[PDB]
Symmetry: D4
């Protein structure tokens, strides 16, 4: 189905299991995909037949920056949950939450969680 | 099925919902995928058994640069529509339209719309 | 299904078919994907309802750096095997092992092996 | 199924429709994916239960550099054809041939053709 | 002399000569370099003898995001001036203010201004 | 002195010694640096005391795309000359003209020429 | 003079002023440059007349990973000092210590310190 | 003075002190800069007054791929020497020879040597 993307949103949050992460904080990145039929929007050039991605950004901003969880998994679930609650037009969404600088002695690009959620 | 790609075409257009975007303009990027059986072209080395991607580029150039819409969704729909009208050989096409520098206070790589279209 | 990623882990190992590779060694990179239902972890914000990716990293570290095989294929199989043995919560995993600097006179980015493994 | 990759092989060839491309030549890039069950190779650490990707590279080198076609589509077909002829172990392969610097006045990253081929 | 760098700070600001830029805003990037004797700090491992680069970031964040000018030149002049004003130990500084997405119809990576300042 | 940059302007031109290049064309890139006192502009926030870099882009776009030379050296000389001719406040400039895709059989990122010019 | 470089060495260390950084750790990067006359080595193809850069790496790995300081300035000072101490043929060196992921709430690529050292 | 660059030439060579490197080989990269007066060439658009950079590439390809040394220092010395020997108009040159994949157990981007040469 037609999809809207928001690529590589960068936030600074305080999520983590260690209390030392809650004090220091670190970068968190989010990739967003929402599914929805967008033919009526492109047919009509009318934004009410689509979804404002500027709001989609503010949703992820609040979950990552205005809150503090232990698991990045909780970030993905609350982001996806809040997407499906407020946009009935969206049928399904895939949320990827990236932790690029975790306290994992080693060498890597990032660790990440990725979920797909739809309504029952 | 066999596919032709045109990766990361960069245009400068004036699409957007805000009138201040229509005056200033901004970058727009398009990723194109068309589906079509290309065995006969590779078997014969004859361009009429394939599709000239140089024309495929000019199609996207006109829709993004020679026109001004409100929604990038309308860019993807008109690009895909004009592909399917003029190339009967193409069975299906996926159009991705990227807005890398939208007026969204925040931090991200881009927002994008992506559709898949075929004939009825 | 919900997935955990570990992107682009870089190790230095001594795997290879040529004995001259076993003496010199070279870079090896691993991309990891594990499948598992992570709703209960995001619902509860409790790490025991998910998998510690810091351990997931140490698993790949041992297979690539604490051992020496002939084939990178054996790296992917042992990494995936050791994932499925120790985490019953993981249903399926996809392992990609990258050899970026092989003794292949030519020009390329990398050669890689990629497998998907689940329990019988 | 298990897969072997060769990422972003760079060659210099003389393929093209215009005679001016046949004289000047240009860069050509190839991404290769072959499908084959690699458990027996990783189980045994024995290269005869897998495929030498160094030969896989030389196959693409000859088709792109030792020959001159009109269409890049013919490059993908002959590469895939020669893969399936010489390696019965390979069940399916996907070939992507990239033309990064075509004579297309405009702005883009590349144009490319991508096919998937198996035995009848 | 010795140097401290703060590489590629990314902000969202509303600078610009045109009124449409002040309403819409756009990304702004800053590269910072300051010059000072760091030998005492490295020998003694004592921040008392160096400059907190977390403050240097806040100084830059202040000019770009807490203020709105017509010119990016004014960002560079006010960042620099604020530095020599507050840090006696800093002898010289080079400020580079990047406007990656200006309203210039064309194809480019960015435009920027760079200044170097010391005390008379 | 202080500096203005226009980083990685990308054009499509028909420069080249060989006649086949003039018919086919290829990408051309230009890095621009101009030197001038920017202190008045940053202090007063007044473009009257600086140089419109939107014009500096158009000057470069003029030489590369509105003209065809044999040498990229001629691009650099004509860009520079046009700058010192039109901008009294500019004391010195460095022009770098990149030919990323020349017809040189080989493996490389680009070839380029760079000149620096001031008034006698 | 002539120069040897060791570009973008990546380590994991526990440096930092805050106690939480010493417990958690983070990535540290180092760019190394040493200056020395290399003409004898290039003319004679004899390492006896140059410096083993495998040792230069181990010297850097020693300071970053075998030691823990408060300041990255101390990394640079101890790397440099260890170089001029052990390599008579090296006349001057420039050390740059990068902290890509400091606990600074904000958006940036990295912060770093850079020193240059010679003998009195 | 004015300059010509040949950026990131990639070769495959068999240089190295250890015998295992000579048997296996590895990538080698070269950055070239030559200095010369280019004003005549840019003013007259006449290659007669400049240097064919296609030859400069072949000179570099000659030393790296047609020869095998112990040291990368010898690559730089022989590339430079061959340049000042064959191009009277070139006043000075800087050669940088990159060994991206040396057999150093560790994590880094590359090691390299850089020399600058002029005539006595």
């Amino acid at each position: 189905m037609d999809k809207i993307y928001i690529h590589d949103m960068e936030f600074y949050g305080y999520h983590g299991v260690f209390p030392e992460e809650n004090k220091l904080g670190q970068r968190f990145k989010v990739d967003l995909t929402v599914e929805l039929d967008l033919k009526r929007a492109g047919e009509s050039d009318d934004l009410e037949h689509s979804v404002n991605y500027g709001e989609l950004f503010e949703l992820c901003r609040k979950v990552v920056e205005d809150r503090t969880y232990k698991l990045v998994e909780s970030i993905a679930e609350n982001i996806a949950t809040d997407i499906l609650k407020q946009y009935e037009s969206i049928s399904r969404c895939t949320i990827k939450v990236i932790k690029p600088d975790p306290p994992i002695p080693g060498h890597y690009r990032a660790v990440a969680v990725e979920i797909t959620r739809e309504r029952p």
